[PDB]
Design an enzyme around this catalytic site. Structure first.
Site, PDB file in Angstrom:
ATOM      1  N   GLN A  55       0.907  -1.130  -0.058  1.00  0.00           N
ATOM      2  CA  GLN A  55       0.152  -0.296  -0.255  1.00  0.00           C
ATOM      3  C   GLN A  55       0.286   1.222  -0.144  1.00  0.00           C
ATOM      4  O   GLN A  55       0.773   2.282  -0.853  1.00  0.00           O
ATOM      5  CB  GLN A  55      -0.665  -0.077   1.371  1.00  0.00           C
ATOM      6  CG  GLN A  55      -2.126   0.995   0.925  1.00  0.00           C
ATOM      7  CD  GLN A  55      -2.820   0.945   2.293  1.00  0.00           C
ATOM      8  OE1 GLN A  55      -4.082   1.234   2.209  1.00  0.00           O
ATOM      9  NE2 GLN A  55      -2.877  -0.235   3.268  1.00  0.00           N
ATOM     10  N   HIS A  86       1.399   3.894  -3.010  1.00  0.00           N
ATOM     11  CA  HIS A  86       0.826   5.046  -3.125  1.00  0.00           C
ATOM     12  C   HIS A  86       1.509   5.948  -3.142  1.00  0.00           C
ATOM     13  O   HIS A  86       1.340   7.665  -2.982  1.00  0.00           O
ATOM     14  CB  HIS A  86      -0.378   5.134  -2.181  1.00  0.00           C
ATOM     15  CG  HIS A  86      -1.835   4.567  -2.164  1.00  0.00           C
ATOM     16  ND1 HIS A  86      -1.502   3.155  -2.490  1.00  0.00           N
ATOM     17  CD2 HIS A  86      -2.788   5.243  -1.487  1.00  0.00           C
ATOM     18  CE1 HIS A  86      -3.147   2.740  -2.364  1.00  0.00           C
ATOM     19  NE2 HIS A  86      -3.571   4.308  -1.615  1.00  0.00           N
ATOM     20  N   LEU A  93      -5.312  -3.374 -11.485  1.00  0.00           N
ATOM     21  CA  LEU A  93      -4.808  -4.375 -11.385  1.00  0.00           C
ATOM     22  C   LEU A  93      -4.087  -4.122  -9.767  1.00  0.00           C
ATOM     23  O   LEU A  93      -3.994  -5.200  -9.297  1.00  0.00           O
ATOM     24  CB  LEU A  93      -3.877  -4.630 -12.583  1.00  0.00           C
ATOM     25  CG  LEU A  93      -3.091  -5.731 -12.105  1.00  0.00           C
ATOM     26  CD1 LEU A  93      -2.232  -6.275 -13.343  1.00  0.00           C
ATOM     27  CD2 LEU A  93      -1.658  -5.573 -11.326  1.00  0.00           C
ATOM     28  N   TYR A  94      -3.467  -3.130  -9.746  1.00  0.00           N
ATOM     29  CA  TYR A  94      -3.115  -2.986  -7.964  1.00  0.00           C
ATOM     30  C   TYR A  94      -3.731  -3.456  -6.901  1.00  0.00           C
ATOM     31  O   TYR A  94      -3.468  -2.664  -6.021  1.00  0.00           O
ATOM     32  CB  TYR A  94      -1.722  -1.866  -8.178  1.00  0.00           C
ATOM     33  CG  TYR A  94      -0.538  -2.779  -7.602  1.00  0.00           C
ATOM     34  CD1 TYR A  94       0.759  -2.170  -8.455  1.00  0.00           C
ATOM     35  CD2 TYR A  94       0.320  -3.369  -6.283  1.00  0.00           C
ATOM     36  CE1 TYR A  94       1.988  -3.053  -7.751  1.00  0.00           C
ATOM     37  CE2 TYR A  94       0.676  -3.779  -5.974  1.00  0.00           C
ATOM     38  CZ  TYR A  94       2.609  -3.781  -6.590  1.00  0.00           C
ATOM     39  OH  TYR A  94       2.796  -4.364  -6.518  1.00  0.00           O
ATOM     40  N   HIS A 142      -6.923  -5.353  -2.368  1.00  0.00           N
ATOM     41  CA  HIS A 142      -7.601  -5.346  -1.415  1.00  0.00           C
ATOM     42  C   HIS A 142      -8.246  -6.658  -0.739  1.00  0.00           C
ATOM     43  O   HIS A 142      -8.271  -6.763   0.764  1.00  0.00           O
ATOM     44  CB  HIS A 142      -8.814  -3.840  -0.918  1.00  0.00           C
ATOM     45  CG  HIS A 142      -9.158  -2.476  -1.340  1.00  0.00           C
ATOM     46  ND1 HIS A 142      -8.732  -2.362  -2.933  1.00  0.00           N
ATOM     47  CD2 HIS A 142      -8.716  -2.256  -0.768  1.00  0.00           C
ATOM     48  CE1 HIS A 142      -7.881  -1.130  -2.938  1.00  0.00           C
ATOM     49  NE2 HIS A 142      -7.804  -0.677  -2.137  1.00  0.00           N
ATOM     50  N   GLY A 192       1.100  -7.785 -14.623  1.00  0.00           N
ATOM     51  CA  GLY A 192       1.248  -6.854 -14.000  1.00  0.00           C
ATOM     52  C   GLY A 192       3.218  -6.678 -13.375  1.00  0.00           C
ATOM     53  O   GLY A 192       3.466  -5.980 -13.215  1.00  0.00           O
ATOM     54  N   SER A 214       5.264  -3.642 -13.784  1.00  0.00           N
ATOM     55  CA  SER A 214       6.295  -3.215 -12.128  1.00  0.00           C
ATOM     56  C   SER A 214       7.769  -3.784 -13.179  1.00  0.00           C
ATOM     57  O   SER A 214       8.624  -2.501 -12.357  1.00  0.00           O
ATOM     58  CB  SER A 214       6.015  -4.589 -11.291  1.00  0.00           C
ATOM     59  OG  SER A 214       4.923  -4.217 -10.608  1.00  0.00           O
TER      60      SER A 214
HETATM   61  C1  HEM Z   1      -7.134  -0.767   5.578  1.00  0.00           C
HETATM   62  C2  HEM Z   1      -7.472  -1.379   4.126  1.00  0.00           C
HETATM   63  C3  HEM Z   1      -7.343  -0.128   3.331  1.00  0.00           C
HETATM   64  C4  HEM Z   1      -8.424   0.600   3.329  1.00  0.00           C
HETATM   65  C5  HEM Z   1      -9.214   0.923   3.581  1.00  0.00           C
HETATM   66  C6  HEM Z   1      -8.233   1.217   1.502  1.00  0.00           C
HETATM   67  C7  HEM Z   1      -9.192   2.129   1.084  1.00  0.00           C
HETATM   68  C8  HEM Z   1      -9.275   2.627   0.055  1.00  0.00           C
HETATM   69  C9  HEM Z   1      -9.730   3.821  -0.455  1.00  0.00           C
HETATM   70  C10 HEM Z   1     -11.018   4.392   0.284  1.00  0.00           C
HETATM   71  C11 HEM Z   1      -9.517   4.181  -1.711  1.00  0.00           C
HETATM   72  C12 HEM Z   1      -9.537   5.353  -2.981  1.00  0.00           C
HETATM   73  C13 HEM Z   1     -11.423   4.584  -3.009  1.00  0.00           C
HETATM   74  C14 HEM Z   1     -12.144   5.586  -3.789  1.00  0.00           C
HETATM   75  O1  HEM Z   1     -11.427   6.761  -4.320  1.00  0.00           O
HETATM   76  O2  HEM Z   1     -13.473   5.311  -4.415  1.00  0.00           O
HETATM   77  C15 HEM Z   1      -8.164   2.780  -2.157  1.00  0.00           C
HETATM   78  C16 HEM Z   1      -8.150   3.020  -3.307  1.00  0.00           C
HETATM   79  C17 HEM Z   1      -6.700   1.932  -2.995  1.00  0.00           C
HETATM   80  N1  HEM Z   1      -6.022   2.027  -2.581  1.00  0.00           N
HETATM   81 FE1  HEM Z   1      -6.487   1.208  -0.930  1.00  0.00          FE
HETATM   82  N2  HEM Z   1      -7.460   1.034   1.079  1.00  0.00           N
HETATM   83  C18 HEM Z   1      -6.453  -0.359   1.781  1.00  0.00           C
HETATM   84  C19 HEM Z   1      -5.754  -0.794   1.426  1.00  0.00           C
HETATM   85  C20 HEM Z   1      -5.130  -1.402   0.045  1.00  0.00           C
HETATM   86  C21 HEM Z   1      -3.963  -2.066   0.176  1.00  0.00           C
HETATM   87  C22 HEM Z   1      -3.190  -3.409   0.628  1.00  0.00           C
HETATM   88  C23 HEM Z   1      -3.285  -2.254  -1.245  1.00  0.00           C
HETATM   89  C24 HEM Z   1      -2.433  -2.811  -2.374  1.00  0.00           C
HETATM   90  C25 HEM Z   1      -1.298  -2.086  -2.658  1.00  0.00           C
HETATM   91  C26 HEM Z   1      -4.362  -1.050  -1.921  1.00  0.00           C
HETATM   92  C27 HEM Z   1      -4.208  -0.223  -3.302  1.00  0.00           C
HETATM   93  C28 HEM Z   1      -5.223   0.577  -3.519  1.00  0.00           C
HETATM   94  C29 HEM Z   1      -5.260   1.197  -4.890  1.00  0.00           C
HETATM   95  C30 HEM Z   1      -4.278   0.795  -6.073  1.00  0.00           C
HETATM   96  C31 HEM Z   1      -5.845   2.200  -4.455  1.00  0.00           C
HETATM   97  C32 HEM Z   1      -6.546   2.813  -5.995  1.00  0.00           C
HETATM   98  C33 HEM Z   1      -5.313   4.605  -6.096  1.00  0.00           C
HETATM   99  C34 HEM Z   1      -5.461   5.587  -6.467  1.00  0.00           C
HETATM  100  O3  HEM Z   1      -6.210   5.807  -7.190  1.00  0.00           O
HETATM  101  O4  HEM Z   1      -5.172   6.639  -6.117  1.00  0.00           O
HETATM  102  N3  HEM Z   1      -5.109  -0.467  -0.501  1.00  0.00           N
HETATM  103  N4  HEM Z   1      -8.052   2.197  -1.169  1.00  0.00           N
HETATM  104  C1  LIG Z   2       9.804 -11.906 -11.776  1.00  0.00           C
HETATM  105  C2  LIG Z   2       7.918 -11.973 -12.150  1.00  0.00           C
HETATM  106  C3  LIG Z   2       8.027 -12.201 -13.709  1.00  0.00           C
HETATM  107  O1  LIG Z   2       8.276 -11.605 -13.723  1.00  0.00           O
HETATM  108  O2  LIG Z   2       7.181 -13.364 -13.386  1.00  0.00           O
HETATM  109  C4  LIG Z   2       6.894 -10.982 -11.432  1.00  0.00           C
HETATM  110  C5  LIG Z   2       7.539 -10.285 -11.447  1.00  0.00           C
HETATM  111  C6  LIG Z   2       7.028  -9.471 -10.818  1.00  0.00           C
HETATM  112  C7  LIG Z   2       5.379  -8.973 -10.703  1.00  0.00           C
HETATM  113  C8  LIG Z   2       4.073  -8.064 -10.065  1.00  0.00           C
HETATM  114  C9  LIG Z   2       3.160  -8.089 -10.339  1.00  0.00           C
HETATM  115  C10 LIG Z   2       1.957  -7.271 -10.018  1.00  0.00           C
HETATM  116  C11 LIG Z   2       2.395  -6.147  -8.953  1.00  0.00           C
HETATM  117  C12 LIG Z   2       4.065  -6.773  -8.713  1.00  0.00           C
HETATM  118  C13 LIG Z   2       4.778  -7.009  -8.897  1.00  0.00           C
HETATM  119  C14 LIG Z   2       5.085 -10.647 -10.661  1.00  0.00           C
HETATM  120  F1  LIG Z   2       4.557 -11.303 -10.295  1.00  0.00           F
HETATM  121  C15 LIG Z   2       6.530 -11.330 -11.036  1.00  0.00           C
END
Ligand code: HEM
Ligand SMILES: C[C@H](C(=O)O)c1ccc(-c2ccccc2)c(F)c1
Ligand code: HEM
Ligand SMILES: CCCCCCCCO[C@@H]1O[C@H](CO)[C@@H](O)[C@H](O)[C@H]1O
Ligand SMILES: CCCCCCCCO[C@@H]1O[C@H](CO)[C@@H](O)[C@H](O)[C@H]1O
Ligand SMILES: CCCCCCCCO[C@@H]1O[C@H](CO)[C@@H](O)[C@H](O)[C@H]1O
Ligand SMILES: C[C@H](C(=O)O)c1ccc(-c2ccccc2)c(F)c1
Ligand SMILES: CC(=O)N[C@@H]1[C@@H](O)[C@H](O)[C@@H](CO)O[C@H]1O
Ligand SMILES: CC(=O)N[C@@H]1[C@@H](O)[C@H](O)[C@@H](CO)O[C@H]1O
Ligand SMILES: CC(=O)N[C@@H]1[C@@H](O)[C@H](O)[C@@H](CO)O[C@H]1O
Ligand SMILES: CC(=O)N[C@@H]1[C@@H](O)[C@H](O)[C@@H](CO)O[C@H]1O
Ligand SMILES: CC(=O)N[C@@H]1[C@@H](O)[C@H](O)[C@@H](CO)O[C@H]1O
Ligand SMILES: CC(=O)N[C@@H]1[C@@H](O)[C@H](O)[C@@H](CO)O[C@H]1O
Ligand SMILES: CC(=O)N[C@@H]1[C@@H](O)[C@H](O)[C@@H](CO)O[C@H]1O
Ligand SMILES: CC(=O)N[C@@H]1[C@@H](O)[C@H](O)[C@@H](CO)O[C@H]1O
Ligand SMILES: CC(=O)N[C@@H]1[C@@H](O)[C@H](O)[C@@H](CO)O[C@H]1O
Ligand SMILES: CC(=O)N[C@@H]1[C@@H](O)[C@H](O)[C@@H](CO)O[C@H]1O
Lengths: 551, 551
Positions: A171, A175, A352-353, A356, A494, A498
């Site tokens: 996360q 971010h 993709l990322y 949650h 992904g 990445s």
């Molecule tokens: C306490 C647990 C979590 C909460 C409460 C949470 C909450 C949120 C909220 C409220 C949003 C924006 C939603 C909207 O605009 O409609 C968001 C976006 C996002 N979250 Fe989470 N999240 C959590 C955990 C995670 C985790 C573990 C990841 C994995 C890396 C993650 C990745 C993302 C991503 C990639 C976005 C979109 C980013 C963007 O467009 O700015 N979240 N999350």
């Molecule tokens: C090294 C390996 C590959 O190219 O197969 C590899 C590399 C990057 C990812 C990856 C996929 C989604 C989010 C973050 C990392 C992954 F899942 C696997």
């Protein structure tokens, strides 16, 4: 009807509208020719028929430990890491191509950094169906779709042993390059920088960075609490932080990424990284007593960027992939290759990322078990327990499996609902189209997508056609690899994003990858030998169990 | 004293301050080793001892027409062009390195586009002399230096036959990427884009662009006068233009580059290019009736960028260089090479491009001879005579020789005076240091620099040491090649900056260089066959004598 709605052009060929009702495919350098870029050239044919499937390769990479242990100790390791790096990277357009406004190359798309790019152009606004040609006139209700196939019923832990230390890192890390602008709307980002620039630590703009800096020894402002170092309050660092109305400034922590005060897990890493930055400044000053604040600050930032890439490839992605191959971070592996040291965040990568499912039912810290309601806007937990305690707790608690479906906690299911809604606003092409764009054969049915029959049947009734299945739902509902955290698509799509994002950073270029860039041999080695354990332990009073894998 | 003031590190090695009084040179990938990166590796030595001098190569390139004609007709042409492209380019760091604020690599220097980059770090602010270690405590008075060695006495025409059509193209062309910010100070630019983005036609910002566009058929706004097409007035295109107070909006033309209303020559090209943009939009619409305004506009812009690069390399640089080798614009020539498709304008490149000696004593248009006071802010000349007439006049009048000294008209000598002053503010390193940075041996004396004795003796008395000679003065006072427009330095230092700027444009990348990028085969060919003559003549009622070479 718009002929491009049928996605006629294959293998990255570009569909162009000609005359009133015609279309042509530009197959330039696709390795194919023909009206649709489907007639292969000899080499294109050999290559495609000799390439084993992603499943087979996955198998090879997750079996035969003994053989891999030998390979990891030789140059074959490098040979393979370079292979992985280049093959995955080539799937990403560079310079970037399209954005939410342009479904074609344009100078505005190339220069306008406030836009997220996209790998596939959008579904033309004038197509008979929302997904182009297949499916029903109306897509399934987002909420219903989420409640039916993504809502968690019984917590499903990740078979690969991924913990919350990893989840929060995930996360925190992402971010810094995923900051969708609420003011400009979807398709737009405030995370200019488009990658690992550590803007979630230094800020996404100069003013904020300056407000976070001490301007002494190149360090970041900070405050002492219980004899420990923590990010400063917003009172001392007048920066905009998203805290619930009512929370006074002196109780808010200023970190770089406005949204981090919303989770102990996030502020934890914010604290760890801040401590590390100031630590590096110390080491640098010892080496360069003549340096001023700016150079100490800048050089420390570069070292941290390097550390971040190192830890992400060798530990984060290692854990995540489960490969027996020892991933390696060595910019030199690409010095003999053709590679553009630039990167642009794609909207698809953002979708993709959304991992949650990783979040648990509750957060266990020692004997105590905290609820989402006790955890979410908690402004004292981090200081109450301190870094070591939380790192230990998060390193011990398993994270949920990402793929497979029905595994997102109800507390945050609304995010998935919104991701699906944004997908439609962004007019993202169908899952199968992305399957092809990333080298995979499209699914011929839902029962093939999911490895079962119950959900498959319901999805077929809702979507009507496998070719209408949307991007995100496809990623989360696709059957997972044997005992993996997610399905092949998540990896095949992904990984390219990445790896291009990691190595596409300028510090990985021949011009920057020099000891002088990091203050000398001492600074360079901090990058070359960075580690999650060291990141935490060289900045904490005691050293807890720290890992991305549960014990 | 600061050990880096002695510029100890050779061959691009990086001087880093260590401890209280020490320094180390990072020779990474310089091809040399040793405390100062002076100990050559085996291949480095062969190359440097087998490499003929710039003068010898220049000779080969400017003699033996018969042999070159034969070569130009074979693949050897491509081979040599690839060579020139890559060897010249490798001299420019990419990603960029330093800026006015940082004399070291930093994330801020990499991401902050408002900064001009620089090839050599500045002269440390704490050096014993302004130039580092050599010279007097105080540099020669800028004004005096200019009046003594740059002021024109008797107009010296360019022996290569360069005309004003070329001279105005140069000014017009460069002002799209050289736009020093007055508000931010030297070292800062408003020409984000840092290259051939045609911002001098479309604006350096969206708002300005939008105000300039018709938003219909992808065209630019315009007006009709005497039945001819010209850029619109500021009244129809409310855009900031730098006109002297007292001139009514109806007499002000809106073009893209705020400063263009200050010379008929500039507005001439602004008109030509505007006419060409709208012309391409027409051709595009014929090909794509379904396209909207945006795509037509964007695609036309891409075609014009290509046309500009094609013409600049094959006719502009061709004329300028005097080479018998037929230069060639072909992005594919680099597809097998390692090349970063990005560019950042360097402050040194800005300095070097101050080609004011090109301007004449007066401007002859037919029987009439116009003085500087009748030409400079003339708001009617362009419309009075029209495009064809001015192109013919400017194509017929010789431009002054650039190098050699004493050849800048008094009317604009103040610019040179300011360039020298800015150089000192920018703390640019000495001429000889730049000589080395670009592969040349430093001059051992002023008499070696100039090909004579008189000025040399006076320069030596003023500067005290050849190693104190400043950048710009060095470029302009260096003895010219036989019958050339300027000295070797101008070519050896400028070519790298130029070629990198041309080929380091995203449209030259494998990803963009496709027919689809330019609307198809028809649009692609407009780029592949662009010509100065066609640029003018396919947009004028009649076709005059149009060339960069005087008849
Ligand atoms: C306490 C647990 C979590 C909460 C409460 C949470 C909450 C949120 C909220 C409220 C949003 C924006 C939603 C909207 O605009 O409609 C968001 C976006 C996002 N979250 Fe989470 N999240 C959590 C955990 C995670 C985790 C573990 C990841 C994995 C890396 C993650 C990745 C993302 C991503 C990639 C976005 C979109 C980013 C963007 O467009 O700015 N979240 N999350
Ligand atoms: C090294 C390996 C590959 O190219 O197969 C590899 C590399 C990057 C990812 C990856 C996929 C989604 C989010 C973050 C990392 C992954 F899942 C696997
Ligand atoms: C009518 C003849 C010309 C006049 C009156 C003129 C005038 C000027 C002026 C007033 C400046 C800014 C000076 C300052 O800020 O102190 C300038 C800058 C410059 N001129 Fe000219 N110029 C002329 C011709 C040319 C030509 C032929 C070229 C060759 C390409 C040229 C290239 C430049 C460059 C590169 C700059 C600096 C750009 C920047 O930093 O923004 N000029 N000129
Ligand atoms: C010895 C090399 C033989 C190469 C023959 C490869 C056959 C590829 O055949 C191609 O398959 C596509 C998808 O089914 C079709 O769309 C193309 O029209 C067809 O030519
Ligand atoms: C045991 C040797 C392992 C070498 C690692 C290969 C790098 C992974 O390569 C991947 O293979 C997939 C399946 O063919 C493709 O779909 C992906 O596009 C490709 O990047
Ligand atoms: C006869 C064939 C000539 C091919 C043109 C070579 C390209 C120009 O090459 C240049 O030569 C200079 C002289 O040594 C060097 O100083 C420059 O760094 C190099 O880029
Ligand atoms: C092709 C040739 C070369 O590389 O020698 C070449 C290329 C570019 C320039 C050039 C130098 C200064 C300003 C504008 C162009 C030049 F003078 C010569
Ligand atoms: C533009 C075009 O020719 N596309 C056709 C489509 O209209 C038709 O429904 C389908 C039948 O298989 O084959 C394809
Ligand atoms: C030989 C070939 O591939 N041609 C097909 C054509 O039959 C089809 O109608 C169209 C739309 O899918 O795509 C293309
Ligand atoms: C957008 C951006 O960050 N540009 C910055 C600018 O704000 C700052 O005033 C200047 C001085 O360092 O450097 C540059
Ligand atoms: C030259 C320039 O624009 N630099 C600015 C500086 O003046 C300002 O005080 C600071 C705070 O935002 O940002 C930067
Ligand atoms: C609503 C809330 O956040 N309260 C909790 C509190 O009950 C708990 O004792 C403490 C532990 O850090 O964290 C906080
Ligand atoms: C730092 C250093 O050792 N530089 C020296 C310099 O001080 C001395 O004046 C010169 C004499 O040739 O040689 C060099
Ligand atoms: C062997 C060698 O090159 N060492 C020289 C040293 O003698 C000189 O004092 C210094 C400053 O120029 O640069 C280095
Ligand atoms: C700095 C810049 O040009 N960014 C532009 C922004 O101003 C514009 O509002 C948006 C919508 O097209 O696209 C982007
Ligand atoms: C989403 C966005 O910011 N786009 C803006 C638009 O709202 C504004 O009308 C235009 C004029 O500057 O520039 C662009
Ligand atoms: C001060 C001034 O600019 N006046 C001249 C005018 O004498 C000349 O007849 C005309 C030709 O275009 O250009 C204008």
């Amino acid at each position: 009807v718009n002929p491009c709605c049928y996605y006629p052009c294959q293998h990255q060929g570009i569909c162009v509208r000609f005359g009133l009702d015609r279309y042509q495919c530009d197959c330039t350098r696709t390795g194919y020719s023909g009206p649709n870029c489907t007639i292969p050239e000899i080499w294109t044919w050999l290559r495609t028929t000799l390439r084993p499937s992603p499943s087979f390769i996955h198998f090879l990479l997750t079996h035969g430990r003994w053989l891999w242990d030998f390979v990891n100790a030789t140059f074959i390791r490098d040979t393979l890491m370079r292979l992985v790096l280049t093959v995955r990277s080539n799937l990403i357009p560079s310079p970037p191509t399209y954005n939410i406004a342009h479904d074609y190359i344009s100078w505005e798309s190339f220069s306008n950094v406030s836009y997220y790019t996209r790998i596939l152009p959008s579904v033309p606004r004038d197509c008979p169906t929302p997904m182009g040609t297949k499916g029903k006139k109306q897509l399934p209700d987002a909420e219903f779709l989420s409640r039916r196939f993504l809502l968690r019923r019984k917590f499903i832990p990740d078979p690969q042993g991924t913990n919350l230390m990893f989840a929060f890192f995930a996360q925190h890390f992402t971010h810094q390059f995923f900051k969708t602008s609420g003011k400009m709307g979807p398709g737009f980002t405030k995370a200019l920088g488009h990658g690992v620039d550590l803007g979630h630590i230094y800020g996404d703009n100069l003013e904020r960075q300056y407000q976070l800096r001490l301007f002494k020894d190149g360090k970041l402002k900070y405050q002492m609490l219980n004899g420990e170092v923590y990010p400063p309050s917003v009172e001392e660092a007048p920066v905009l932080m998203h805290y619930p109305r009512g929370i006074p400034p002196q109780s808010q922590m200023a970190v770089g990424q406005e949204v981090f005060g919303l989770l102990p897990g996030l502020m934890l890493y914010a604290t760890i990284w801040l401590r590390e930055h100031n630590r590096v400044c110390d080491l640098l000053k010892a080496e360069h007593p003549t340096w001023g604040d700016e150079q100490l600050f800048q050089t420390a930032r570069l070292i941290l960027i390097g550390e971040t890439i190192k830890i992400v490839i060798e530990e984060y992605v290692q854990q995540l992939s489960g490969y027996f191959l020892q991933l390696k971070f060595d910019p030199e592996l690409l010095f003999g290759a053709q590679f553009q040291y630039r990167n642009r965040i794609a909207m698809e990568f953002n979708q993709l990322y959304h991992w949650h499912p990783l979040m648990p039912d509750s957060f266990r810290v020692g004997p105590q078990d905290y609820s989402y309601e006790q955890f979410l806007f908690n402004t004292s937990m981090l200081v109450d327990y301190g870094v070591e305690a939380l790192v230990d707790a998060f390193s011990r608690q398993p994270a949920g499996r990402i793929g497979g479906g029905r595994n997102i906690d109800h507390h945050i299911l609304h995010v998935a609902v919104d991701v699906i809604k944004e997908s439609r606003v962004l007019r993202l092409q169908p899952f199968n189209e992305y399957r092809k764009r990333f080298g995979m054969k499209p699914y011929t049915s839902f029962q093939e997508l999911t490895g079962e029959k119950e959900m498959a049947a319901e999805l077929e009734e809702l979507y009507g056609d496998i070719d209408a299945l949307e991007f995100y739902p496809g990623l989360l509902l696709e059957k997972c690899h044997p005992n993996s955290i997610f399905g092949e698509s998540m990896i095949e799509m992904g990984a390219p994003f990445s790896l291009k994002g990691l190595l596409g950073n300028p510090i990985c270029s021949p011009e920057y990858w020099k000891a002088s860039t990091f203050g000398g041999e001492v600074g360079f080695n901090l990058v070359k030998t960075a580690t999650l354990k060291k990141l935490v332990c060289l900045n904490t009073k005691t050293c807890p169990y720290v890992s991305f894998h549960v014990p």
